[PDB]
Design an enzyme around this catalytic site. Structure first.
Site, PDB file in Angstrom:
ATOM      1  N   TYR A  75      30.619  38.344  33.710  1.00 25.17           N
ATOM      2  CA  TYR A  75      29.546  37.448  34.206  1.00 25.17           C
ATOM      3  C   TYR A  75      28.248  37.457  33.404  1.00 25.17           C
ATOM      4  CZ  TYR A  75      32.306  35.829  38.131  1.00 25.17           C
ATOM      5  OH  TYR A  75      33.278  35.270  38.901  1.00 25.17           O
TER       6      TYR A  75
ATOM      7  N   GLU B 267      35.193  37.511  44.821  1.00 26.45           N
ATOM      8  CA  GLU B 267      36.339  37.940  44.003  1.00 26.45           C
ATOM      9  C   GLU B 267      36.737  39.417  44.228  1.00 26.45           C
ATOM     10  OE1 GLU B 267      34.894  36.330  40.238  1.00 26.45           O
ATOM     11  OE2 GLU B 267      35.247  34.346  41.236  1.00 26.45           O
TER      12      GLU B 267
END
Ligand SMILES: Cc1cc2nc3c(=O)[nH]c(=O)nc-3n(C[C@H](O)[C@H](O)[C@H](O)COP(=O)(O)OP(=O)(O)OC[C@H]3O[C@@H](n4cnc5c(N)ncnc54)[C@H](O)[C@@H]3O)c2cc1C
Ligand code: HEM
Ligand SMILES: Clc1ccc(CO[C@H](Cn2ccnc2)c2ccc(Cl)cc2Cl)cc1
Length: 398
Positions: A95, A137
């Protein structure tokens, strides 16, 4: 979560990013991918140049930026993206890389207009957004039927139409996966991690394929349409690889079943609200799995099987479908050959399916677009329409 100073900036600068979308996102991928080349083992370079991924920045940034006031309105799409991200092994650590290049892209494109407060504000907005994803997630990861990629063996290769093969696949010794006692919900897909030998390709290629059956006793079954070249661009990378090069007996790497696409479990066990299974082309696959469930759980339910394909020859699962439909009390089998008949329109769906119905639809990006529009006009409640596109779903909403 995000502050109003830094939330104002975001709203105020959406018009620039919306107008400069394509350029920024092009800059983003150019930079990020030629710096971190290993990432080409995750991203599919062809997405940028074909489907819905040239405005994807501007899809996922315009969506965010436009919904920055209340990000929770996107929670459904986040969950669906999530399944894909976990499926694809996207980890907390990926990320920051994205964010780092997202700001670097903006700075390159906006210049001195992208001030330190503008950059700052997006840096902030980003982590806020990423934090929702990492959290969604994480839960998916701890809930997967098995961790990461695991080696399976190709135990059968069978044509189920002129250009769709069905791979039946079994986990290899020491993968730690016992086939039976793997709870699959019909409508889930698995994901493969292959490394094509053709087309000068040098990296891994990851693709989701819908399971044909929730039954696992004899292996996992998925079916792959051959995305050919014809007169224009090149063949689809992995579909050609699978079709042409994946031999029975070869190894293939899969990650656990993902996805939200499932039939309503409450409506399975009743006969008043009919089940509508609406498919085009290889899209039939999760629907076949869904059909198998309804027929086995309760074959008295009214079923409408609406399958479209170009041909009788290109019509997938003829034997399979017939055999399941033979088992039910009240079915309507509706086969559309688009070489003989018109594409499915709203008019058609009105006549061919009931006004109140529990509907599930699958196929190309474009087939979804169409079907969702049609069912919305016939005023099927959103709760009753469910769909799974064979491309990016962030471009089949609004
Ligand atoms: C949840 C989900 C479930 C799915 N289930 C299935 C399933 O059960 N069965 C199935 O067959 N598929 C399924 N799909 C679609 C599948 O995962 C892949 O998207 C598909 O196999 C294409 O991959 P590819 O590598 O062969 O083609 P890619 O190499 O990824 O390219 C895609 C397409 O672009 C075209 N193309 C290539 N280059 C260009 C260019 N330069 N310009 C314009 N066009 C170009 C190719 O001809 C090809 O048609 C599913 C997708 C999702 C998201
Ligand atoms: C908050 C940040 C992110 C957002 C909003 C986002 C959004 C999306 C969306 C909308 C899709 C399309 C899936 C679908 O339509 O079903 C997607 C897929 C994908 N995402 Fe992300 N994603 C994010 C973070 C990341 C990160 C950090 C990575 C890894 C670097 C990543 C890698 C991928 C890949 C590889 C795909 C599909 C394969 C491809 O595009 O070639 N994503 N994401
Ligand atoms: Cl707020 C936000 C930040 C990132 C992203 C989506 O991230 C994509 C890349 N991508 C695509 C799929 N998975 C990852 C992206 C980032 C930056 C730019 Cl400039 C373009 C794109 Cl396409 C979405 C909202």
């Amino acid at each position: 979560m995000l502050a109003e100073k830094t939330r104002s900036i975001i709203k105020a600068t959406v018009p620039v990013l919306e107008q400069q979308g394509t350029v920024i996102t092009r800059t983003f991928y150019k930079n990020m991918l030629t710096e971190h080349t290993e990432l080409l083992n995750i991203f599919n370079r062809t997405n940028q140049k074909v489907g819905a991924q040239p405005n994807a920045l501007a899809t996922t940034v315009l969506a965010a930026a436009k919904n920055i006031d209340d990000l929770s309105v996107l929670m459904d799409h986040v969950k669906q993206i999530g399944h894909k991200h976990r499926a694809l092994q996207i980890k907390p650590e990926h990320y920051p890389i994205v964010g780092e290049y997202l700001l670097k892209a903006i700075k390159e494109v906006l210049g001195d207009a992208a001030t330190p407060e503008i950059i700052n504000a997006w840096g902030e907005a980003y982590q806020a957004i990423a934090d929702i994803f990492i959290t969604v997630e994480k839960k998916m990861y701890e809930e997967a039927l098995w961790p990461g990629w695991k080696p399976f063996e190709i135990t059968a290769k069978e044509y189920v139409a002129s250009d769709i093969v069905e791979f039946t696949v079994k986990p290899k010794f020491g993968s730690g996966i016992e086939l039976e006692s793997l709870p699959i919900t019909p409508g889930q897909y698995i994901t493969v991690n292959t490394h094509p030998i053709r087309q000068e390709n040098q990296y891994d290629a990851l693709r989701h394929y819908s399971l044909c059956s929730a039954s696992t006793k004899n292996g996992l079954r998925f079916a792959v349409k051959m995305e050919a070249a014809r007169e224009n661009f090149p063949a689809g990378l992995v579909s050609e690889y699978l079709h042409k090069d994946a031999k029975v007996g070869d190894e293939i790497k899969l990650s656990a079943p993902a996805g939200d696409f499932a039939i309503n479990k409450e409506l399975i066990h009743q006969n008043e609200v009919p089940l509508v299974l609406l498919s085009s082309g290889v899209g039939v696959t999760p629907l076949l799995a869904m059909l198998e469930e309804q027929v086995k759980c309760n074959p008295n339910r009214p079923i409408y099987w609406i399958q479209s394909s170009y041909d009788e020859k290109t019509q997938a699962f003829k034997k399979h479908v017939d055999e399941l439909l033979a088992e039910c009390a009240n079915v309507d089998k509706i086969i559309v050959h688009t070489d003989t008949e018109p594409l499915i329109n709203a008019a058609f769906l009105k006549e061919k399916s009931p006004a109140h119905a529990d509907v599930y639809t699958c196929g190309s990006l474009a087939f979804m677009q169409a079907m969702i529009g049609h069912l919305k006009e016939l005023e099927h409640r959103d709760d009753m329409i469910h769909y799974e596109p064979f491309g990016p779903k962030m471009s089949t909403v609004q």
